[model samples]
Target chain A: GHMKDLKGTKTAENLKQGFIGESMANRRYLYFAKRADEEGYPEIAGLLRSIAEGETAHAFGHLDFIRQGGLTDPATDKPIGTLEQMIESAIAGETYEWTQMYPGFAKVAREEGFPEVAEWFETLARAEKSHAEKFQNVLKQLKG
Target chain B: GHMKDLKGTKTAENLKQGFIGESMANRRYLYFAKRADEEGYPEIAGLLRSIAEGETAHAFGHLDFIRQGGLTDPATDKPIGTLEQMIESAIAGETYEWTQMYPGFAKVAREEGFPEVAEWFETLARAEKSHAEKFQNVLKQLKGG
Candidate 1:
């Protein structure tokens, strides 16, 4: 069926799912590529990086289809409210990634014997903390 | 002082972190843009999308720096083993996203009054399951007698 016909249907759901899956797969493969490079397997790293790019393109295609299908509508008011709220939301997301997500990922990387990847995750976690702080500073200035 | 000098130092850590943060911000902003459009604020949506693209570029710059710094090394053998192991790793990651990550995100979306976004997360959760299954099938075929 055409993209329009797929709206609000099971297939549309599939497409949405595909978008998320592909997006994540792109990140995972890129990470794998980095690992391969570190392991002295540049060829494998190149192959994984190429596949990661393809996965990114696939994700973009799925998102385009989702947007075209009018699936962006919310059942209620939009979750994002004022500018301050937006900043607050950003802070919360960054905090979660910093404190929870990246730490967990880093632990797994360390356990897997990928010290460099683990270090990368740790760096990202700290960066997220910096992001949270930056947002907090903006919010503070706005309030002042 | 230079990018090369920044390698293997504290600044390199910051760059790597910046890459991941910017990448995630791009995705978050894009989702926010869609929400704005749905709310009949197309201008805000456009603005958010524009910023999202910038975030993507920032992420790319960070990754480029990290790569140039030669920070992609591992401490030991690569975690990815045989071809079958690679596929298995893919399956495990997809399964975690499907069963854990997306579901948690969907719960928060629903709690936050974003039904459509929640639905989107649910959809993605299923897609991850499909990915896992597809990888499993490939692994199965590879091991077949």
Candidate 2:
């Protein structure tokens, strides 16, 4: 309530969205990391764990930048879990991000003349590549 | 990375700690809010829901003024929920906060010459009173209680 005017701004609203998404992802990845640990995929867990911290880094970056107020319930309308299913879904997501989503977003950012945003997307795309590799590596080990 | 050196400063560290705690509380309250709604305590949920938003206000206030980053896994060592127990516990918590915790915190803030912090505590105490009242009311209606 103190920063009501500032909270009404687009920057603040967008940062809130970014923070919520990143925060949820951070928690989700931690859950996934635990599953990896339980499944005996230590390296995959470590990779996912590190990236989990990075998601939080982005969250705090957005949060500190805006310093706005809000709350949201991140739970889905229904149960959304199953160990193997979650891993597969994450693999699918990372694959889409690196191969299709971020690549296209970066190009659009370039056209909009936000080179830093473009760079951010490129960097994230590379990070997503590493994530997919970790999941794929886990599959190889499991196959063995 | 931007605030790497600042992060080491005492003020920044304090704010970061406060931010994390408050942010966690905000989410916790939201979970409780949902529980209240599910229990058919819509009014109680609304009150806790606003207080949840207030927690975020304090969180962002800390993060914005002092810049920082880091996160902790919020999961307890084990499953930490039982619907009926959580309701009672929440009611107890709000009662304690309004009755003792915030009043003392505010008094200390004032003694230390932190008028702003004192104001924050006092304001939060008022809000917590409303929360306790709502929970108490819900407790009465909760035949399940």
**lDDT digits (tens) for residues A1-144 of candidate 1:** 123444435555555555545654665566556656675766556756765665555565555555555553121111234455555667677787788877876776566455665676687678668767866776686578
Clashes of each: 0, 0
Using DockQ as the measure, the top candidate is 1
lDDT string for model 1 (B24-139, tens) is: 46655665556566757666567567656655555555555555555541211123334545556676776777888778767765665556656867876787677677667666
Docking class of 1: incorrect
Docking class of 2: incorrect
Name every residue pair that clashes in candidate 2.
Answer: none
Q: What is the C-alpha lDDT profile of model 2 across B49-126, one tens digit per residue?
A: 665555555544443334212322221111112322323544555566668866776676566554554575576578
Best candidate (score: lDDT): 1
Native contact share for candidate 1? 0.00
CA lDDT of every candidate? 0.58, 0.48
In Å, residue A143's CA in model 1 sits off its true spot by 14
